[PDB]
Amino acid sequence: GKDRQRALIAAVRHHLKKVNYQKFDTLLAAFRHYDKKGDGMIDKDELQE
Amino acid sequence: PQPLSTPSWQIETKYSTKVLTGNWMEERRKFTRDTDKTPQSIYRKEYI
């Protein structure tokens, strides 16, 4: 009963991987864009936005 | 005298060196073992 969950997680993860690769040249810039607050950690509202 | 996996002009799809296909042993190790001192000459070695 978790097949829809696994499919949606896989689709979102692959889409985020390709979007990060196409937008950000490096990985530190991607992390700093994902985390706007500068605390060093990524929160749930940061992830959803 | 040619091994079956020697590098050549044949076009093959190359994977990482973890995968045991083609030439992997020759790429796993490192080239450099080049440390020595100059061992001087016959003349100074012999004539004391």
């Binding site: 490096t26 530190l28 992390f31 060093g40 | 990482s16 973890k18 790429e27 796993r28 190790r29 490192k30």
Partner: peptide
């Protein structure tokens, strides 16, 4: 990226066996 802490010293590994490039721990 090595200068910029977020990553522990154990997190950096060589990419392959006897290779110059550095990557992260999986």
């Amino acid at each position: 990226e090595e200068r910029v802490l977020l990553i522990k010293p154990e997190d950096i590994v060589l990419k392959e066996a006897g290779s110059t490039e550095k990557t992260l721990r999986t």
